[PDB]
Amino acid sequence: PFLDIQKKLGISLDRHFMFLSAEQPYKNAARCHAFEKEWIECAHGIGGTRAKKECKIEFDDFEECLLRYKTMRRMHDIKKQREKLMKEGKYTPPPHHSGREEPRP
Amino acid sequence: ISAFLKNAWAKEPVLVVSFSVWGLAIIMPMISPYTKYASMINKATPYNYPVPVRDDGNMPDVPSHPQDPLGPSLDWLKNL
Amino acid sequence: PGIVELPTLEELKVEEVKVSSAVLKAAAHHYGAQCDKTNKEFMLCRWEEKDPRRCLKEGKLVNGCALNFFRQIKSHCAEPFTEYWTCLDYSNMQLFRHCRQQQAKFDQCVLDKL
Amino acid sequence: MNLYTVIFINILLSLTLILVAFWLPQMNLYSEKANPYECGFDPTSSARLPFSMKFFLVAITFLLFDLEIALLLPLPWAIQTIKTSTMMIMAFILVTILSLGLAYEWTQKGLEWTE
Amino acid sequence: MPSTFFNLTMAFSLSLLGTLMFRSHLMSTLLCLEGMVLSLFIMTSVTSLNSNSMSSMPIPITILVFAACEAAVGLALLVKVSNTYGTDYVQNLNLLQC
Amino acid sequence: MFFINILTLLVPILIAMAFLTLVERKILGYMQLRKGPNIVGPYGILQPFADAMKLFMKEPMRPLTTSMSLFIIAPTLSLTLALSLWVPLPMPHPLINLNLGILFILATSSLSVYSILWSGWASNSKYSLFGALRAVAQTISYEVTMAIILLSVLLMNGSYSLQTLITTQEHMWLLLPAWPMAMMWFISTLAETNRAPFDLTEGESELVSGFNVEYAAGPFALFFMAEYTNIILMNALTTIIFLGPLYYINLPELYSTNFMMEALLLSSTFLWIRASYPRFRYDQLMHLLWKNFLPLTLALCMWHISLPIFTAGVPPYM
Amino acid sequence: MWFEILPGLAIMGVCLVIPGVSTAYIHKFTNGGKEKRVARVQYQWYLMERDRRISGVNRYYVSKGLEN
Amino acid sequence: YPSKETAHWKPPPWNDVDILKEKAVTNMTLNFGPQHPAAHGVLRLVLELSG
Amino acid sequence: MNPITLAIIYFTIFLGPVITMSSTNLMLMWVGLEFSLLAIIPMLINKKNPRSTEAATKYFVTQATASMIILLAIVLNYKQLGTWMFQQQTNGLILNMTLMALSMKLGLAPFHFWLPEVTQGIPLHMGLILLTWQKIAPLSILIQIYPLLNSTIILMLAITSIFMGAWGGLNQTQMRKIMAYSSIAHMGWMLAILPYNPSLTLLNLMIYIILTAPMFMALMLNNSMTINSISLLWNKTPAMLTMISLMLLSLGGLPPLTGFLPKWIIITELMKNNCLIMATLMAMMALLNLFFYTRLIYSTSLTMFPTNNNSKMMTHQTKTKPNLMFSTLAIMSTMTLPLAPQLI
Amino acid sequence: RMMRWNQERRRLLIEDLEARIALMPLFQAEKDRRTLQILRENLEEEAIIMKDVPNWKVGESVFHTTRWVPPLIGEMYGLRTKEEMSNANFGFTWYT
Amino acid sequence: MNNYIFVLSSLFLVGCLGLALKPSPIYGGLGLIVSGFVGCLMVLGFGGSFLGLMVFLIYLGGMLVVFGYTTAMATEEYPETWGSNWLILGFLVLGVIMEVFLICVLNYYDEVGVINLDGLGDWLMYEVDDVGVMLEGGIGVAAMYSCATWMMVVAGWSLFAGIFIIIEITR
């Protein structure tokens, strides 16, 4: 913040709900709690300029957890190949994936 | 002001009632034994799981079994 | 990057309760009393490891304890328990307040016999 | 799926009644019958012209009061908190501020219709 | 989520476009602003529900409150311009050219 | 089967409304020292059927200046909304069990007003405009306090679910804890249904007929069907919220029948009032509400926020 | 006389009793002789789905007790 | 620097008040009758209403 | 306005920016923006004349659109990074839109056509607030995100506004519009130096405020609002001419006066960063400002314009309007270069 | 009366929530095994489907970290049928 | 059901398109009512509840007041609908077809990206706490009474100041 009134006075008007890893009602952690925590603890201390290069792995994991682009790519590719193989006639959907399974408790 | 209050009581009873009820809404919570118990009850209600904590051998108060005497007791809620 | 390490279908096999939600509710309180150490060890495993693949051996002990508990009930207090959880199942939200008498019967039966 | 089914059933019932009402009756359409109604005499002017609203101020004030309603509607879940004192103080401040705004408007003649 | 966010961003874009190009009535411009408000609230709501971030669900309601306050101010300004000129046409709002 | 349940919930409600019309006419006649409908069928039972057939066989007008789309849509919306609102009401088991049933009721009721607004604007007639802009003020009046009253009463229920009120009133009516609010809620229902002493959107005396002046035949009949169904609905909501029937998990029939008795009582009281009182003016209504109920309503909401705390009687959630 | 008002009121009373009684009966009929299990929380949904998978008929109302 | 357009421009008013072409107030003209429930059948009260 | 309205409205105008500069959360900065926007309008439309209403409407529409664009930026940044603050990894388009919308709020070109009209419409004592106090919040929002801004976009806007303000100043005869255009030019400098060293952006903001407030109070003194009107101060109030001349020249930016320090230091930083072309062009075009200030100086202080018969009674009557703050700010703005090192 | 009745309801709610807490460990283990079985079935099928696609690592994670990441419903029910997927998406929202 | 959410979002887009084209304010209000309903449905389908219902309520109230204002001020002898103006009609159809074609283009260029019509409905919900109890959005919103009181303070002040501002603008 431009003027650090809150840090100066020791109060926390709005600094406690900045990210997904902050305290949630009834201790229900948000999606990607672990990833965000890792990224932020990695990036503490070192400046932003250094973090942008030295916490990149953590940030990449975090964005993957939150948006999930690569997961969508992977599932799309798997189901695309499934469709191609099925149209060719070289694959069958197993019983458990088809609709009849031995349902587990 | 006895005169103005007495007149208000008859000519604008609605506002007299509203202001009186608002005043009571503020006054009573401070003046009441039971107020402390609301937060205790809401803390008693167990929405989430009680997470066990590993016994390092030097934790003397937290019990080992739920039926052990040690630990918080809701007798106060039972006979509030 | 690395191949995930899912456990095999064989090691994800264990004898399972196969008893309905009403039954579990009716048996909950005594099942929370007895079978405490086992469940609590498994729960600590879950929370400490954070990896579901690393607590399977303890979860199966949880299942075994549940089976033992229910086998004991079936052996001794079976009929009162059936009455109790029938009455519970009938209720819309499986509320205890509706079946207290049958609850008293079951509780007395277990207290004396077991 | 049940709510969608029942709402669509209601829609279809209403629309079916309308269609029956429009295709069953025997009709005769002519200009004098169709022309608008105004106590037996022809319209001195169309009804699309500006129509002054004499309660515009109260109408706008309704917007803000309804948003206050929105702010207050979480109270039933709020009371299930642990910070009961904080919740009480905040709700009391909110409602008292509501009352003060209404009182100022009243004393300033906001609610008296404009002539 | 992805398709929904794309369509919602397009909706906000269209409402912004509608606001930027006028069409005589100031009331319609106010309505376009109000529609952008709707789209933004929906964006925030879906984002929070997707992330299970219940600490950020207090914020869409603040968006609604402040958007309502500004909309009320806009309506009052419409009332004043109407009192001045007899209509809400934006053409009449051209005095300050000089 | 769900469709059979839908039929059992719709058809009886519509018939009950149909005969609410007859009951109104006969009660008013007797209170005014006349007998009312009693020649069409035995004791006038067939009067609603004759009326409905006549209305749906009369030619539906389509006035030239009107906007056909809205002029046709509005009645459909009125009937659809009035019928829909009966969906989640526990009697004692709701057909559809909604967690936020009260908010759903409020949303549907609020959208109800748009039927009147759009019909009046689409008529493109001066009396139609008068009716529509009177309905606007009627809404601006009741809507401010309806939400607060529901909040205050639900502050003893702990959740917006309707079914929870069945348990809330297990050992007592909510009327006793909140009789001051019950009265304000009753007047608010009187206003919302647009009925006397608050029937200012269709007041025959002032506007030949309001929003419905240009409507005729079946399109017209839908408006009145929705009006009377809404009367029954709102009195049912009052009966469920306040004046809780007797619920015992052993017999839901007891709840159903007791609810019927009380709902008929209140619906009869609506007509009682209609015949007993004059008509408010459409600025006096707003003044009444804003300057009498709202000052009291806010104080009562404050007090009912305080009550669960200083009495340590927080409602349970779930 | 005021008695002649009451035929219409009786028709009403019947027509408004049918909804609730029918709903209760049909809910009980279509949910295995037991009132419909309300799912007002993910916990209740999970319990119902567990029963659905356990029953083996893909029905949540079918209850398996100690015998299973 | 006057140009083609700016010739018709005029200096702004000293006080910000600007003399405006009068806005005639056109009250609506309702026909409270003849056929009205309150007109007693034969009155064409030509009401001139504002709001 | 009754006292309670004055208290609440002025307090909200003061609150908004303070919230913006003391909020760590983007939604709360947006809340501060909305506070300022809502609260200013009644002060603008206080007069209730036809021009005032139109000025208030223009302000409302423009600022509402800007606020919505900023809110879109905030929401999309949330969608991306699960947080309420802009990070180095934030998508570039989000920052571009934020800069663009805060530019619209600030009045920078090419989103500058709205400011002159509103300033012309509104009275002077509110023109001061509009051209001073309402810029602190948006510029604070930018400064809090300075390391991530786009040099190309910022320099383009800055040079555009310098050129546009300089050219617009010449034509106008109205003092209110002249001060609007001066505002545009100085903001152009501020944003030009923002991405490189925001300390100098804040220095320029301070000096511009400290120079504009005295000038606005000078205009308020005799409600002067035109070149012709201000030309009569040699008769109505001779004393002020010296400081008015000095202050206009400073705003223009002549060396001995303080106005040089902002421009000189900013040019120095830009040259350090190798921004030679933009620095040269901005310095060159900042001289039209001196031209259309020198015309004012000629009209008021150096030449004596024709007066009226009735000014004699203005002479007769007494005056008690100039404040202490006028003298303090005017001297401390036009006689402080020798203390420049302490300022930067 | 409302105070006393509400207090009674609070006690009953605590009792029911305690029953849930007592039973939760069993449900957590069952869910663990079920989700792991679903994941491994998916892996087997993926092994067959993507046998000959040029460059595919069958069990490759999309995450650098080796920590366990809970599987989201898309992964869990992706290869199953539209019925199961739509159940996972709407079973609770669309009521019971 | 697979296309449920995408259809709702497209309907929202169409309602917003109509609003942008800006017919008479009456039709604008009607269009925004439909759009608010569809948005509430989208939020409901995304696991929300209180937020969707609140948007619907507040928007119904807002459009009520707006309609009242339009009948008085924003009115014309011949209000223009969407279809009345041929340019509006043509651009309505153009916008609909343009969005259809843009959807196709984005799908083709990025088979998986902003839009995944193939695989649509497979990513609506990501995670859910299966055995939880307190996960309802009303709880998060009510948090303003405990953990985010600053939000309440600022919003309440906004409404309070709104009262005075509105009165003095309308004086």
Swiss-Prot record, chain B:
Residues 55-80 are annotated as: Disordered. It is found in: Mitochondrion inner membrane. The chain crosses the membrane at residues 15-35. InterPro entries: NDUFA3 (IPR026626). Its main location: mitochondrion. It is a single-pass membrane protein. It comes from the Eukaryota. PANTHER family: NADH DEHYDROGENASE [UBIQUINONE] 1 ALPHA SUBCOMPLEX SUBUNIT 3 (PTHR15221:SF0). Complex I is composed of 45 different subunits. Accessory subunit of the mitochondrial membrane respiratory chain NADH dehydrogenase (Complex I), that is believed not to be involved in catalysis. Complex I functions in the transfer of electrons from NADH to the respiratory chain. The immediate electron acceptor for the enzyme is believed to be ubiquinone. This is NADH dehydrogenase [ubiquinone] 1 alpha subcomplex subunit 3. The gene is Ndufa3.
UniProtKB/Swiss-Prot annotation, chain D:
GO terms for molecular function: NADH dehydrogenase (ubiquinone) activity. The keyword Ligase does not apply. The keyword Transmembrane applies. GO terms for cellular component: mitochondrial inner membrane; mitochondrion; respiratory chain complex I. GO terms for biological process: aerobic respiration; cellular response to glucocorticoid stimulus; mitochondrial electron transport, NADH to ubiquinone; proton motive force-driven mitochondrial ATP synthesis; response to light intensity; response to oxidative stress. The chain crosses the membrane at residues 3-23, 55-75, 86-106. It is a multi-pass membrane protein. InterPro entries: NADH_UbQ/plastoQ_OxRdtase_su3, NDAH_ubi_oxred_su3_sf. It catalyses: a ubiquinone + NADH + 5 H(+)(in) = a ubiquinol + NAD(+) + 4 H(+)(out). Keywords: Electron transport, Membrane, Mitochondrion, Mitochondrion inner membrane, NAD, Respiratory chain, Translocase, Transmembrane, Transmembrane helix, Transport, Ubiquinone. Disulfide bonds: none annotated. Core subunit of respiratory chain NADH dehydrogenase (Complex I) which is composed of 45 different subunits. Interacts with TMEM186. Interacts with TMEM242. This is NADH-ubiquinone oxidoreductase chain 3. The lineage of its organism: Eukaryota, Metazoa, Chordata, Craniata, Vertebrata. The gene is mt-Nd3.
From Swiss-Prot, chain I:
It comes from the Eukaryota. Core subunit of the mitochondrial membrane respiratory chain NADH dehydrogenase (Complex I) which catalyzes electron transfer from NADH through the respiratory chain, using ubiquinone as an electron acceptor. Essential for the catalytic activity and assembly of complex I. Coiled coil: none annotated. InterPro entries: Complex_I_Subunit_2, NADH_DH_su2_C, NADH_UbQ_OxRdtase_chain2, ND/Mrp_TM. It is a multi-pass membrane protein. This is NADH-ubiquinone oxidoreductase chain 2. The lineage of its organism: Eukaryota, Metazoa, Chordata, Craniata, Vertebrata. GO terms for cellular component: mitochondrial inner membrane; mitochondrion; respiratory chain complex I. Belongs to the complex I subunit 2 family. It comes from Mus musculus. One of its GO terms (molecular function) is NADH dehydrogenase (ubiquinone) activity.
From Swiss-Prot, chain K:
Gene3D superfamilies: NADH-ubiquinone/plastoquinone oxidoreductase chain 6, subunit NuoJ (1.20.120.1200). Its main location: mitochondrion. Core subunit of the mitochondrial membrane respiratory chain NADH dehydrogenase (Complex I) which catalyzes electron transfer from NADH through the respiratory chain, using ubiquinone as an electron acceptor. Essential for the catalytic activity and assembly of complex I. Signal peptide: none annotated. GO terms for molecular function: NADH dehydrogenase (ubiquinone) activity. Keywords: Electron transport, Membrane, Mitochondrion, Mitochondrion inner membrane, NAD, Respiratory chain, Translocase, Transmembrane, Transmembrane helix, Transport, Ubiquinone. The chain crosses the membrane at residues 1-21, 38-58, 86-106, 147-167. This is NADH-ubiquinone oxidoreductase chain 6. It is found in: Mitochondrion inner membrane. It is a multi-pass membrane protein. It is an enzyme of class 7 (translocase). GO terms for cellular component: mitochondrial inner membrane; mitochondrion; respiratory chain complex I. The keyword Repeat does not apply. Core subunit of respiratory chain NADH dehydrogenase (Complex I) which is composed of 45 different subunits.
